[PDB]
Amino acid sequence: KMPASRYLTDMTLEEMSRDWFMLMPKQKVAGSLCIKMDQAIMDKTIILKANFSVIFDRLETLILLRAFTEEGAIVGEISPLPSLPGHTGEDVKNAIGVLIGGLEANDNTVRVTETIQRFAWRN
Amino acid sequence: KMPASRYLTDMTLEEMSRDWFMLMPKQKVAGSLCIKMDQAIMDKTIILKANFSVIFDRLETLILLRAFTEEGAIVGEISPLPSLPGHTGEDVKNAIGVLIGGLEANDNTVRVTETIQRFAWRN
Structure with missing residues (x-):
């Protein structure tokens, strides 16, 4: 059946x-997700925002995640690769880890929205 | 304060x-909303879908409403004009009325999504 x-x-x-571009590109293909990051971004305050599919008041699938600066510049992205099989909840959690990891390594303050928190908390 | x-x-x-086009345009500027409809569309099954802003699990502002056929063709739209002052709940309800009215006049079966239903029910 289908809801x-x-x-x-x-x-x-x-x-x-x-559309956004990275001065110093860095891409990883962890799980069935593509993780993009500009390694030229340093000493900034990043906010991770997302778009999830929602069935019965519960977040199911990650459609798109994007890292923004206080000024509003896209510095990172997590997005699914259509060609590959559907990503898992762990894949999403690991991707966010890789993105936060990489961004903090360039001395950045990375905070996430409650939606990403709720998703991660419940998988 | 503002959340x-x-x-x-x-x-x-x-x-x-x-992007979509209307062979037989019909546009109205009711409230602070722009209401578009193709009067060339007849004897079809239309479904009204929407994007609402959501604060504290309650729909607040209409961002975009679009009328689709079973095949997926955009036949209508309700969208706010940024230049004009914020639209009211009644403006949204009246707009949906105008759109459903106009579409049914060209012998169309118009059904709405539960999100539009909930919004209208609570204003």
């Missing part, structure tokens, strides 16, 4: 659609 | 961002 998914996001349409 | 807004949507990123 019919809705989407809950921390980001506005523009924040999600917006 | 941080999140967004709940029935539509996918593509469905929201997608």
Whole structure:
């Protein structure tokens, strides 16, 4: 059987659609997720925001995660690769780890939105 | 004081961002909303989908509403005009009325998503 998914996001349409580039690229393909990070970004305050699929008041699938600075610049991204099989809850948690890890290594203050917290807390 | 807004949507990123055209335009500026409808669309099954801002598990502001056919074609839209002052709950309800009205006049079966239902029920 099949219910019919809705989407809950921390980001506005523009924040999600917006094209961005990295001065010093770094990409990892952990799980079935693509993790992008600009290694030229240092000593900034980053906020991890996300878009999740939601079935019965519960977050199910990660559609898109993006790292923003206080000024509003995209510095990182976690997104699923359509070609590969569906990502797991652990894959999402590990990806966020890799992104937070990498960003903090360049002396950045990384905080996450309650939506990512709730997702991670419940898997 | 002001709390941080999140967004709940029935539509996918593509469905929201997608550009669409009307062979027979009909546009109205009711409230602080722009109401678009293709009067060339007849004898089809329309489904009204939406994007609302959500604060404390309660829908607050309409971000975007779009009318889709069973095949997935955009036949109508309700969207706020940023230049004008914030739209009211009644403005949204009246707009949906105008859209459903106009679409049914061209012998169409118009059904709405539960998100629009909940919004309208509570204003």
